[PDB]
Structure prediction request, 105 residues.
Amino acid sequence: GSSGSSGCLRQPPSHRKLFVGMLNKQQSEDDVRRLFEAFGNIEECTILRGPDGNSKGCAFVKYSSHAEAQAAINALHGSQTMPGASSSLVVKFADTDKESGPSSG
Prediction:
């Protein structure tokens, strides 16, 4: 059943990345690997490390599709609170075109 949508509007965006922050300088790529994937499959993972060297409490994680992404987000972001931080984990859809834009130039 449920065949035939005949309704295309505000269709979802195009991006398989997720920006995670409010992390602790203890966890490792692995920890975040299993944890995340624990819900929705992951395509790639890359921990962020500022020039200083010590993790900046951030990392880039990708998923197979949107649905899965949201699952991990709600299941993670706003759920627990990384050690040290007072605010629940922060996981949002990572953007690609930040600097660029249709700005009237």
Q: What stands out?
A: Residues 66-76 form the longest helix (11 residues). The radius of gyration is 16 Å. The beta strands are 17-21, 42-49, 55-63, 90-93.
